[PDB]
Amino acid sequence: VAYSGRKIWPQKHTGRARHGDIGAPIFVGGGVVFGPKPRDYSYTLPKKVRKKGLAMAVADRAREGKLLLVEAFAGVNGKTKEFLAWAKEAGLDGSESVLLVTGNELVRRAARNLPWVVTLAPEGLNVYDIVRTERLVMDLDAWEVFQNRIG
Amino acid sequence: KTYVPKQVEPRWVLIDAEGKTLGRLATKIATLLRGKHRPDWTPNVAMGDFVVVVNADKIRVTGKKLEQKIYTRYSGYPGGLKKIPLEKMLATHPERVLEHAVKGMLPKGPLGRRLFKRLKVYAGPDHPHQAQRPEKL
Amino acid sequence: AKHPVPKKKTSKARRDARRSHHALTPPILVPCPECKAMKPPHTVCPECGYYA
Amino acid sequence: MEAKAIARYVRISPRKVRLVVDLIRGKSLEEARNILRYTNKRGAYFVAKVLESAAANAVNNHDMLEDRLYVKAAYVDEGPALKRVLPRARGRADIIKKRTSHITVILGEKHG
Amino acid sequence: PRAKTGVVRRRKHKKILKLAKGYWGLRSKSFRKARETLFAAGNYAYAHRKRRKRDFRRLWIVRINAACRQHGLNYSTFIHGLKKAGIEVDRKNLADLAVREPQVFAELVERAKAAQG
RNA sequence: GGUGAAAAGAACCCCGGGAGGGGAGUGAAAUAGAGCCUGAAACCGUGGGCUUACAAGCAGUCACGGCCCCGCAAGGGGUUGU
RNA sequence: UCGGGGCUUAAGCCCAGCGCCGAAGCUGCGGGUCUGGGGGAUGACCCCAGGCGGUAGGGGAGCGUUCCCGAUGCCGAUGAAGGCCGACCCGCGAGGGCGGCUGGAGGUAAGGGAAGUGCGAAUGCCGGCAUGAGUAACGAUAAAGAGGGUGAGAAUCCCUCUCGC
RNA sequence: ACCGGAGCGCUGUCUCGGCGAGGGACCCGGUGAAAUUGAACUGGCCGUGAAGAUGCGGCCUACCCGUGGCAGGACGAAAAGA
RNA sequence: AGCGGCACGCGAGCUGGGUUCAGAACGUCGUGAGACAGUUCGGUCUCUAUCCGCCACGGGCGCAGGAGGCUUGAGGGGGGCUC
Numbered sequence A: 001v002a003y004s005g006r007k008i009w010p011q012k013h014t015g016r017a018r019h020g021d022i023g024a025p026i027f028v029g030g031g032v033v034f035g036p037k038p039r040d041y042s043y044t045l046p047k048k049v050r051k052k053g054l055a056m057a058v059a060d061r062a063r064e065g066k067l068l069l070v071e072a073f074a075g076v077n078g079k080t081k082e083f084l085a086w087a088k089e090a091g092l093d094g095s096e097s098v099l100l101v102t103g104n105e106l107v108r109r110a111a112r113n114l115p116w117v118v119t120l121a122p123e124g125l126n127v128y129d130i131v132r133t134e135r136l137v138m139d140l141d142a143w144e145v146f147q148n149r150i151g
Numbered sequence B: 001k002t003y004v005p006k007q008v009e010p011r012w013v014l015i016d017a018e019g020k021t022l023g024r025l026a027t028k029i030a031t032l033l034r035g036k037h038r039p040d041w042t043p044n045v046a047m048g049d050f051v052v053v054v055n056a057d058k059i060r061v062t063g064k065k066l067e068q069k070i071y072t073r074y075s076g077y078p079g080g081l082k083k084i085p086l087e088k089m090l091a092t093h094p095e096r097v098l099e100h101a102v103k104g105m106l107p108k109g110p111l112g113r114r115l116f117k118r119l120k121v122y123a124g125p126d127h128p129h130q131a132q133r134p135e136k137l
Numbered sequence C: 001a002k003h004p005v006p007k008k009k010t011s012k013a014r015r016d017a018r019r020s021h022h023a024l025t026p027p028i029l030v031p032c033p034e035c036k037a038m039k040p041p042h043t044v045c046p047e048c049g050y051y052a
Numbered sequence D: 001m002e003a004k005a006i007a008r009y010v011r012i013s014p015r016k017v018r019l020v021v022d023l024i025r026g027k028s029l030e031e032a033r034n035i036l037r038y039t040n041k042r043g044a045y046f047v048a049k050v051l052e053s054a055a056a057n058a059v060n061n062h063d064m065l066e067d068r069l070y071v072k073a074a075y076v077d078e079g080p081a082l083k084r085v086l087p088r089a090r091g092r093a094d095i096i097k098k099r100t101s102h103i104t105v106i107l108g109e110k111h112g
Numbered sequence E: 001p002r003a004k005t006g007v008v009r010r011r012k013h014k015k016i017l018k019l020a021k022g023y024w025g026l027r028s029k030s031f032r033k034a035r036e037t038l039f040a041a042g043n044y045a046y047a048h049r050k051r052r053k054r055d056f057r058r059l060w061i062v063r064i065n066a067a068c069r070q071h072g073l074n075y076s077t078f079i080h081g082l083k084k085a086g087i088e089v090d091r092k093n094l095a096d097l098a099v100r101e102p103q104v105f106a107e108l109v110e111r112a113k114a115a116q117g
Numbered sequence F: 001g002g003u004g005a006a007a008a009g010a011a012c013c014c015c016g017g018g019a020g021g022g023g024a025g026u027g028a029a030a031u032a033g034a035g036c037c038u039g040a041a042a043c044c045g046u047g048g049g050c051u052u053a054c055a056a057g058c059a060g061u062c063a064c065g066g067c068c069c070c071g072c073a074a075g076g077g078g079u080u081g082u
Numbered sequence G: 001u002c003g004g005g006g007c008u009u010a011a012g013c014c015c016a017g018c019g020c021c022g023a024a025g026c027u028g029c030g031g032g033u034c035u036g037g038g039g040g041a042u043g044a045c046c047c048c049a050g051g052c053g054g055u056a057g058g059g060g061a062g063c064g065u066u067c068c069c070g071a072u073g074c075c076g077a078u079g080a081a082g083g084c085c086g087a088c089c090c091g092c093g094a095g096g097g098c099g100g101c102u103g104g105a106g107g108u109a110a111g112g113g114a115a116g117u118g119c120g121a122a123u124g125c126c127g128g129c130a131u132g133a134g135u136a137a138c139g140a141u142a143a144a145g146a147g148g149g150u151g152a153g154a155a156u157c158c159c160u161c162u163c164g165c
Numbered sequence H: 001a002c003c004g005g006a007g008c009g010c011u012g013u014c015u016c017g018g019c020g021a022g023g024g025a026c027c028c029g030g031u032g033a034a035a036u037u038g039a040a041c042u043g044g045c046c047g048u049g050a051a052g053a054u055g056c057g058g059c060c061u062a063c064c065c066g067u068g069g070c071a072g073g074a075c076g077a078a079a080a081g082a
Numbered sequence I: 001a002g003c004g005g006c007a008c009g010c011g012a013g014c015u016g017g018g019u020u021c022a023g024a025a026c027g028u029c030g031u032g033a034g035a036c037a038g039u040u041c042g043g044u045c046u047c048u049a050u051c052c053g054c055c056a057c058g059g060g061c062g063c064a065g066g067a068g069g070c071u072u073g074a075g076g077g078g079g080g081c082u083c
C-alpha cells in the first residue's frame, strides 16, 4: 500500500489510541490482510484417470443410447443451412444439445453457430464437454482416434 | 384456571386490648389486615378486614419490657438517635406502641402501607361508631 | 476539563425534564383605548399616541 | 381544508425557534399575529414571516377565509449544520455548529 | 472473490431490536443495550417458569388453609386427613372448591376428620 | 461518483428584502426538483393510545387486574397498577 | 437492631412423639436428541430402556454472505435487488417461506465448486449524531450619550453635537 | 534580585474583621464551546460481598421538576504509575 | 490547658516549610560513572460540578366544594461553659 512509514502519533500521553502507520489493516484504506494474490489453480490429474473418465463418459452416453456415429456428411460445404438440412435427416431436430466431433473443418464451420451444437476437434474430445451436451455424435475418423487414446 | 375475586366489601372488626400480650395480639391483627383467612386470598389487591382496637393503653407485656424495651428513632442530623423506652410510650402516646408492632408485621411495599391505613387504634374505647363493629377475640 | 466533568451522559429523559421550566409566556396585552389594536399596558405605541 | 407554508434552511438554532413556535400552536391567526408581534425573541421574526406566508396561500390558493383561520399545527425541524473551527487555548481547536431550521406552519378554517 | 458485509449484519441487529421493543430508553433503541437486556430477560423467564409452579403451590395452600380453618381445623391436619383417607383428589389447585362450591369442601372436611381420628 | 428515457431544469400568479415556500406546469414517477436513484441506524421533532406527582432502581421477568385497539368467536396486539 | 416485628408454663434451652410446608432432587403427563437392544426382507418408520451442567479444549451436523459451473437456460414492468412492517407458516437453532407498503432493473433453483465469508467490545480505523448546555465564553475595565439620515430591517452604517483615551 | 540570626521604623501579616470602588458572578436579548459519558428509574444506617456499596440483606427515610451556592462521595476527571 | 476515631478526617477546600525529579556543594563510599533513613541552598499544586450529599430559594400537583385571615405542634433543630 502506498503510504508512509512514520508512526502516526507518539503512543504515550497522547490519550489517543495507539498506532504505527496508516498502512496497518486496522486503518481504513490500509493494506488488506490475508487477501488473495495471483496463484496457479491447475494440478496434474493422473493420466490413467484422464483416460478412464473419457471412456466412461462416451460409454455413459452410449448405454444411454444417445451416442451416434456417422460419415454420410452430405451437408459439407461450410454453410449452416446445409448442416441444418443434414441434421433433420439424421434426426438431430435440434431438440437436444449436441457435441459434434469431426476432423472436417467445414462441417465444423457449418454447425458452429447453432446454439444447440458444440463443434469440436477429435483431439479435443473431453469429459466436461461430453457431459455438458445431451447427445454425442461423431464422424468415424474421430471414433478411430477416441478408440485410439483408449479402447 | 385459578379463581380471582371481584370488588369485595370491607368487613370491619372490633378488637379489645386489655390483658392481651402486645406481640401475640399484634400477630392476629396483621393476619386480619391481609386476607389470609378469607379463602379468596389475593396477595396483590388488599381486601383484609378493617380492624379497630380500643383500650390499647392497657396492653400486657412480659419480662421487664416496660423499662428494658426501648424504641429507637433516627433524625437525619448528627446524634439524631432517640431512645424512647416502653414505659414512656404508653405514658405518652400509647396507641403508638401497638402501631410500631403491627406495622412492623405488615409487608414492606406500597400495598403494605395501604393496609396500615386500614388499622384504627385507640385508648378508650369510645371509637367513632361508624357502622360494622363485630367484636372478636 | 480541569477537575470536574460529567460522570455520565445525561439521559434524554432527565435532559427534557430539566427543561420543564423553559417554556415562554405570551406578552401581556390590552386593546388601546384610542385605536383598535393591541398595546403592552402602560406604554405608548405607533399608529396611535396620547392625550396631553 | 388546510394550507401550509415552510421556510427551510433558516440560520437559527432549532431549540431556540421552537420556543416561539410552541407559543402560538393552535391559536387564532389574529392572536398569533399579536403574540409574535410582541414576543421578545429573534425567532419570532422568522416564525411570523412564515406565518404570514401560510395565510396568503390559504387565501390566494385555497379560498379559505382570513377572518377565520388558525394554526392547526406547526413545528420546526433541524436542517444541516454549518460547522466551523474555533482556535482554543494551547493550540487545541473546537468545531462549533451553527445550526439551522426548517419552520412549518399549517392553517385551517375555524369551524363548519 | 470478496464478500462484503452486505445486509447480513443489519438484519441480525434489526431482528433483535424487535425482540427488545418496549424496553426503557436505550435498552430498546441501541442494539448493544438491547442484546444485554434480552440476555437477562431469557434467563428471568426460564427461572420464572419454574417459579410459577411454586407461586401457586402456595396461593392455593393459603386459600385452602383459609377456608379450612373456618371449619375449626388447620391445613396441616386437613392434608393429614385427606391423605390418610387416600383421597388423592383435590390436587391443591382444585381446592379452589373452598371458594365456589363450598359444601363439597365441608364434605371433604368431615371425611378428613373421620379419617384422622 | 448517480436528476430523468429525454431538461421537458418548473413560464406565469401569490407571501417574502432575499432565502424558501404555495399554486399553475412538465414527467410514468417531483416523497426523481437539481450534490436531486435507492434512503437503513444513531439523533431531533409533530400528533395519537396506554401510563406517572407516598415513591427505593442492572430497569427486566412471572401473575392478576384496568384502559385503548384488532376479529361474529375462543382469541390476539399495545400499555402498566399491585 | 436477634434479618426486623416481636417473643417469657416461650416464638428460649433440654428429652419424647404425630403432622404439614419446603429445590430445577424423585414421581406423574407430553416432547426433543443421542446411545444401545428389538420389529422392520424395507430406506422410511414403530417400540422399549438409558444418557443429555460445563470454562480451556477435542469431535459431529448445519445456517447465511461473495463468486463459478447448471445459463444461448429460468424468474422479472401483471415489478428484480434493496428498504419498512407482520399477532402468520416451517426450522431445536443460525435461518427459510408468505402477506402489505416502498422500490424501479435486475435476479439466480435442484446439484456441485471456490473463498477478501458472519463483529459488541481491540484508550481499534472512517463517518454521522448525541451528552455536558442554552451552560463557560464573546480576547485587555481608554467610555460612552443624543439628534438627524439611509434602509425590508439599525445600540453596531453615514452626518452633527457632547463625553472619554 | 545568593543563604541564616537580630534590632529600629512601618504596617490589615495577625488579634479580627468591617465598609466602600470597579471588572466578573446573577437576570433579559444575540451568538454559542469543552473534557467526560456501559446504560440509569443514581437516598441514609448497620451488615454484607474481591477485604471501603445509589445497585445485595435488614432496617430507617423520602410528593414531581428546577435555580443560586459548597466541595464529603461517586475508590471523581486527566496521563495503559514516573 | 484530656486522650483517641473519622483513608494518622479534611490538597476536585488552601498552603507546600518537610519528603520524593532534573541544578549545585559538604562529609562519606567508590579507580570510575556515581551513590547516602547523612547534610546544605534552589526548584511549575490543573477557571467551568453531571450524579449522590450539603446550604439556600422557587415552579408543579396534591390535601375528594371554592376563597380571605388566624392558628394547633406530631416531628425536628438551637442552646447547655466557668471563675
Ligand SMILES: [Mg+2]
Binding pocket: A002, A003, A004
Ligand atoms: Mg506516498
Ligand SMILES: [Mg+2]
Binding pocket: A005
Ligand atoms: Mg522508520
Ligand SMILES: [Mg+2]
Binding pocket: A001, A003, A004, A005, A023
Ligand atoms: Mg511502506
Ligand SMILES: [Mg+2]
Binding pocket: A011, A012, A013
Ligand atoms: Mg507509554
Ligand SMILES: [Mg+2]
Binding pocket: A029, A030, A031
Ligand atoms: Mg486500499
Ligand SMILES: [Mg+2]
Binding pocket: A112, A113, A114, A115, A116, A117, A118, A119
Ligand atoms: Mg454453438
Ligand SMILES: [Mg+2]
Binding pocket: B068
Ligand atoms: Mg438489657
Ligand SMILES: [Mg+2]
Binding pocket: B109
Ligand atoms: Mg412493586
Ligand SMILES: [Mg+2]
Binding pocket: none
Ligand atoms: Mg419493586
Ligand SMILES: [Mg+2]
Binding pocket: E004, E005
Ligand atoms: Mg467484515
Ligand SMILES: [Mg+2]
Binding pocket: none
Ligand atoms: Mg442538467
Ligand SMILES: [Mg+2]
Binding pocket: none
Ligand atoms: Mg414554485
Ligand SMILES: [Mg+2]
Binding pocket: F017
Ligand atoms: Mg437591503
Ligand SMILES: [Mg+2]
Binding pocket: none
Ligand atoms: Mg424561488
Ligand SMILES: [Mg+2]
Binding pocket: F023
Ligand atoms: Mg403543486
Ligand SMILES: [Mg+2]
Binding pocket: none
Ligand atoms: Mg401528469
